């Protein structure tokens, strides 16, 4: 942690905030992919949400409603 903090001061907010923000960008940019990879780009967004969806499940909360 401290090694990466010193090597790069830039950091992002954990708790699944980054995975949810990345999923929204990938979902919007997937529309700009005129080829069969469009279905794969959408799948990358839903797959990114499993990390935050897993933290909600392990905490004893509804994963999808919290997602």
């Amino acid at each position: 942690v401290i090694r990466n903090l010193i090597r790069d001061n830039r950091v992002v907010y954990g708790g699944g905030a980054a995975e949810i923000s990345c999923a929204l960008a990938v979902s919007q940019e997937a529309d700009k992919c005129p080829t069969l990879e469009q279905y794969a780009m959408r799948a990358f967004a839903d797959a990114l949400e499993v990390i935050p969806m897993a933290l909600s499940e392990n905490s004893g909360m509804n994963p999808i409603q919290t997602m």
């Binding site: 979902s27 999808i64 409603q65």
Partner: protein
């Protein structure tokens, strides 16, 4: 009103009345809803495309339930 029809064979007159029904049916659709739309499954794609954008604004379980409604329309085209 009433329509008189003539034709050589039974099939020649049969398809004439079958076609008049579809003509009357499609015309009936325009009377109730004076509008037209494209075919080829294009309504299902615009429906599936904008519903996915509509689900992003929704909250709760309706997001995945509406996204699944959008993906289901893609079976037609």
């Amino acid at each position: 009103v009433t329509i008189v029809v003539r034709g050589s064979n039974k099939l020649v007159i049969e398809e004439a009345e079958r076609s008049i029904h579809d003509a009357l049916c499609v015309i009936r659709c325009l009377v109730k809803k004076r509008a037209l739309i494209a075919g080829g499954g294009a309504p299902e794609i615009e429906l599936a495309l904008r519903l996915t954008e509509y689900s992003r604004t929704l909250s709760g379980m309706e997001s995945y339930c509406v996204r699944a409604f959008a993906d289901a329309m893609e079976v037609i085209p």
